[PDB]
Amino acid sequence: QDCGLPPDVPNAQPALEGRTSFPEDTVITYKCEESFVKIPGEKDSVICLKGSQWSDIEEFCNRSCEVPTRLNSASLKQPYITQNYFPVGTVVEYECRPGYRREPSLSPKLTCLQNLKWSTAVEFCKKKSCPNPGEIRNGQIDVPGGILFGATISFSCNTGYKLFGSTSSFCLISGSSVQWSDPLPECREIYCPAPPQIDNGIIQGERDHYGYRQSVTYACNKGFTMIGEHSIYCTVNNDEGEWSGPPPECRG
Amino acid sequence: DCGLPPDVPNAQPALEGRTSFPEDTVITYKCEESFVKIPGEKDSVICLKGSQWSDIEEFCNRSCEVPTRLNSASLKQPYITQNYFPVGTVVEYECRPGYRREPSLSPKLTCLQNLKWSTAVEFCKKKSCPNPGEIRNGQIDVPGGILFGATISFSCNTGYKLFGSTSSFCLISGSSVQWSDPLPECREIYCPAPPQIDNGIIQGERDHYGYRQSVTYACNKGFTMIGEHSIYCTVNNDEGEWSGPPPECRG
């Protein structure tokens, strides 16, 4: 009442599970081979009936391409995203990822070749561009390599100014577009410490704040002699303001 | 002939090594130290007939030496030509060039009883020069005031070069004190135009690059930077030199 090994089917291998005898009614399914994917709505299973006789079954395997290769720019559309049977002459449609944009002139579709390959994908999905970094007052923006999605920029200040904020920004995908990860920082005027007050002398028309390269002029009182640099200026070293040198002396 | 002339207090006859003087021979007496001859008085004798010298009374009086030379002031007329400074004598001074009178102080001097002049005050001060001024991107070193005879030097802030005199002198000029040289100039030492690299560019290029200023490079699409992405203008001996070599844009 049992059947022997099931029939032979081209491009298909029956899943016996190590067994050699199959009891009546036992249903065996065939599994296609590499480069093969069972045709939809096509029987791939036999059923052992009376007289130790397996039912009838005809080739159900066809040649097909593997699942489209993952692309960083575009992702498959429905329902190709869940398919596996890519009979030759089949098209798969892609949809730009986040954050990439479609290149009108290029087709987002793909096709399956004879040696089981695909149509080399174009650049249908380009990288989304970021907003102009802008300008930094008394600072600079280093754009090593463009401002496209995944790009990076760095910040620096002009001599005499200190950096307050982020030293770099990234073009990251935000919502429906790419946006710079951090805000444009600020370059703060590095002010020098209030100039030293000297004995018997004064500061010719002082000042509220002394910045980089700004000088302080000194003047002795009546009956005193100036012995030294008539004035000093502000130097900046490591975002640190420092006076050029020692103030002058007002010898009596 | 007459023998040696008579003896006169505080005075010594100029005989010239002689011992015998022929008639009419006139001999003059020269006062001694601390002694100056009174004006208009006889200071001479004459050998007359009878081997008899002429008459003569004392003609020297006590006096101070000529006022000592002062750097600030110079004697006035007519003291500038006098020599007879009997005690209780006043000489008047007049400021030199270039000194200025000190109102509160007397420019006069008195011949003290001990044949010494009254210690001179500072009636004549040194004339002050005009304020050196301010040097843009430079400095003025006033080692010792700006008075007459003073000296000031000049230097430039880092990044600027000196063009002109390195010093000036408060020399005497006309009827006042004036600086010997003009206030020089400090010229920004500009670096050579930044090198242009292959396959790259200069981010926000500039007209002139000064001290500490930097140039940032960027590679075109498809190229990769090779080296330091920026250079800063250094200055060495009023000479502008780039920090180093520009980056490279490798394809």
Swiss-Prot record, chain A:
Q: Using the chain's own numbering, where are the disulfide bonds?
A: 3-48, 32-61, 65-112, 96-125, 130-171, 157-187, 192-234, 220-250
Question: How is the polypeptide modified once translated?
Answer: The Ser/Thr-rich domain is heavily O-glycosylated.
Where do the coiled-coil regions begin and end? Answer: none
Annotated Sushi domain residues = 2-63, 63-127, 128-189, 190-252
Q: Which GO terms describe its biological process?
A: complement activation, classical pathway; innate immune response; negative regulation of complement activation; positive regulation of CD4-positive, alpha-beta T cell activation; positive regulation of CD4-positive, alpha-beta T cell proliferation; positive regulation of cytosolic calcium ion concentration; positive regulation of T cell cytokine production; regulation of complement activation
Question: What GO cellular component entries does it have?
Answer: cell surface; endoplasmic reticulum-Golgi intermediate compartment membrane; extracellular exosome; extracellular region; ficolin-1-rich granule membrane; Golgi membrane; membrane raft; plasma membrane
Give me the glycosylation sites of this protein: 62
Question: Which keywords appear in this protein's UniProt record, sorted alphabetically?
Answer: Blood group antigen, Cell membrane, Complement pathway, Disease variant, Disulfide bond, Glycoprotein, GPI-anchor, Host cell receptor for virus entry, Host-virus interaction, Immunity, Innate immunity, Lipoprotein, Membrane, Receptor, Repeat, Secreted, Signal, Sushi
Q: Name one GO molecular function term.
A: virus receptor activity
Q: Does this entry carry the keyword S-adenosyl-L-methionine?
A: no
**Which tissues does the record link to its expression?**
Expressed on the plasma membranes of all cell types that are in intimate contact with plasma complement proteins. It is also found on the surfaces of epithelial cells lining extracellular compartments, and variants of the molecule are present in body fluids and in extracellular matrix.
Q: What is known about what this protein does?
A: This protein recognizes C4b and C3b fragments that condense with cell-surface hydroxyl or amino groups when nascent C4b and C3b are locally generated during C4 and c3 activation. Interaction of daf with cell-associated C4b and C3b polypeptides interferes with their ability to catalyze the conversion of C2 and factor B to enzymatically active C2a and Bb and thereby prevents the formation of C4b2a and C3bBb, the amplification convertases of the complement cascade. (Microbial infection) Acts as a receptor for Coxsackievirus A21, coxsackieviruses B1, B3 and B5.
On assembly, the entry states: Monomer (major form) and non-disulfide-linked, covalent homodimer (minor form). Interacts with ADGRE5.
UniProt remark on domains:
The first Sushi domain (SCR1) is not necessary for function. SCR2 and SCR4 provide the proper conformation for the active site on SCR3.
Query: What protein family does this chain belong to?
Result: Belongs to the receptors of complement activation (RCA) family.
Descriptive protein name: Complement decay-accelerating factor
Q: Which organism is it from?
A: Homo sapiens (Human)
Gene assigned in the entry: CD55
From Swiss-Prot, chain B:
| Gene behind the chain | CD55
Which keywords does UniProt give here? Blood group antigen, Cell membrane, Complement pathway, Disease variant, Disulfide bond, Glycoprotein, GPI-anchor, Host cell receptor for virus entry, Host-virus interaction, Immunity, Innate immunity, Lipoprotein, Membrane, Receptor, Repeat, Secreted, Signal, Sushi
* Location of the Sushi domain: 1-62, 62-126, 127-188, 189-251
According to its UniProt entry, this protein's organism is Homo sapiens (Human)
Q: State the post-translational modifications.
A: The Ser/Thr-rich domain is heavily O-glycosylated.
Indicate the quaternary assembly.
Monomer (major form) and non-disulfide-linked, covalent homodimer (minor form). Interacts with ADGRE5. (Microbial infection) Interacts with coxsackievirus A21, coxsackieviruses B1, B3 and B5 capsid proteins.
Q: Which GO terms describe its cellular component?
A: cell surface; endoplasmic reticulum-Golgi intermediate compartment membrane; extracellular exosome; extracellular region; ficolin-1-rich granule membrane; Golgi membrane; membrane raft; plasma membrane
Q: Which disease is it linked to?
A: Complement hyperactivation, angiopathic thrombosis, and protein-losing enteropathy: An autosomal recessive disease characterized by abdominal pain and diarrhea, primary intestinal lymphangiectasia, edema due to hypoproteinemia, malabsorption, and less frequently, bowel inflammation, recurrent infections, and angiopathic thromboembolic disease. Patients' T lymphocytes show increased complement activation causing surface deposition of complement and the generation of soluble C5a.
Q: What is this protein called?
A: Complement decay-accelerating factor
Glycosylated residues are: 61
- Work out whether the entry's keyword set contains Repeat: yes
Q: In which tissues is it expressed?
A: Expressed on the plasma membranes of all cell types that are in intimate contact with plasma complement proteins. It is also found on the surfaces of epithelial cells lining extracellular compartments, and variants of the molecule are present in body fluids and in extracellular matrix.
Q: Name one GO molecular function term.
A: virus receptor activity
Function text = This protein recognizes C4b and C3b fragments that condense with cell-surface hydroxyl or amino groups when nascent C4b and C3b are locally generated during C4 and c3 activation. Interaction of daf with cell-associated C4b and C3b polypeptides interferes with their ability to catalyze the conversion of C2 and factor B to enzymatically active C2a and Bb and thereby prevents the formation of C4b2a and C3bBb, the amplification convertases of the complement cascade.
Name which cysteines form disulfide bonds: 2-47, 31-60, 64-111, 95-124, 129-170, 156-186, 191-233, 219-249
What's the record's remark on domains? The first Sushi domain (SCR1) is not necessary for function. SCR2 and SCR4 provide the proper conformation for the active site on SCR3.
Q: Which family does it belong to?
A: Belongs to the receptors of complement activation (RCA) family.
Phenotype for residue 206 to H: In GUTI(-) antigen
Effect caused by changing residue 18 to L:
In Tc(b) antigen
